[PDB]
Amino acid sequence: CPPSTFNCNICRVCAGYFRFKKFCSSTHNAECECIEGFHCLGPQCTRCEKDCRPGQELTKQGCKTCSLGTFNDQAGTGVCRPWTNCSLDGRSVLKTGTTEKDVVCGPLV
Ligand SMILES: *[C@@H]1O[C@H](CO)[C@@H](O)[C@H](O)[C@H]1NC(C)=O
């Protein structure tokens, strides 16, 4: 297919933020994937999106901010998880929660 051997047509080129997932051959077209530090945005991978910051998680529709009351301290990986509930643990709140940081509970009251 890169030399004219035509259903085979013209080969896709994977450059920049794209690299080759599957190389082109006589039987099939080349397939792209996103470079490390990036992920496919949409089902066909027409765009790449930068891996998510802390305070976000990777969904099927790209990076999304953690919903209020959840956090993700990891950069480029992990899931938004609920804040520690100090009250259920018999403790009080010493430092409040954020999208990036869990609540810090105090000593046993
Ligand atoms: C902890 O969970 C209890 C039980 O549902 C609830 O009363 C309390 O408001 C919760 N607090 C936080 C900070 O999540």
Description:
The structure is a monomer. The chain has 109 residues and is mostly beta strands. It has strands at residues 18-22, 31-34, 38-41, 47-50, 56-59, 62-65, 70-71, 81-82, 91-95, 104-108. The strands form five sheets. It has a two-stranded antiparallel sheet. The termini are far apart. It folds into two domains: 1-34, no CATH class; 35-109, no CATH class. The chain binds 2-acetamido-2-deoxy-beta-D-glucopyranose. Residues 85, 87-88 line the site of 2-acetamido-2-deoxy-beta-D-glucopyranose. The PDB classes it as immune system. Keywords: Tumor necrosis factor, apoptosis, immune system. It forms a monomeric assembly. The entry is titled "Crystal structure of murine 4-1BB N128A mutant from HEK293T cells in P43 space group".
Short description:
The protein has about 110 residues and is an all-beta fold. The chain has strands at about 20, 30-35, 40, 45-50, 55-60, 60-65, 70, 80, 90-95, 105-109. The strands form 5 sheets. Strands 1-2 form a two-stranded antiparallel ribbon. A two-stranded antiparallel sheet has the order 3-4.
- What's the helical proportion of residues? under 10%
Rounded radius of gyration (Å): 22 Å
Number of domains: 2
What is the oligomer described by this structure?
Answer: monomer
Order of H and E elements: EEEEEEEEEE
| SS elements, strand count | 10
Number of helices: 0
What is the overall shape? rod-shaped
Biggest sheet overview: 2 strands, antiparallel
- Ligand kinds: 2-acetamido-2-deoxy-beta-D-glucopyranose
* Order of strands, widest sheet: 1-2
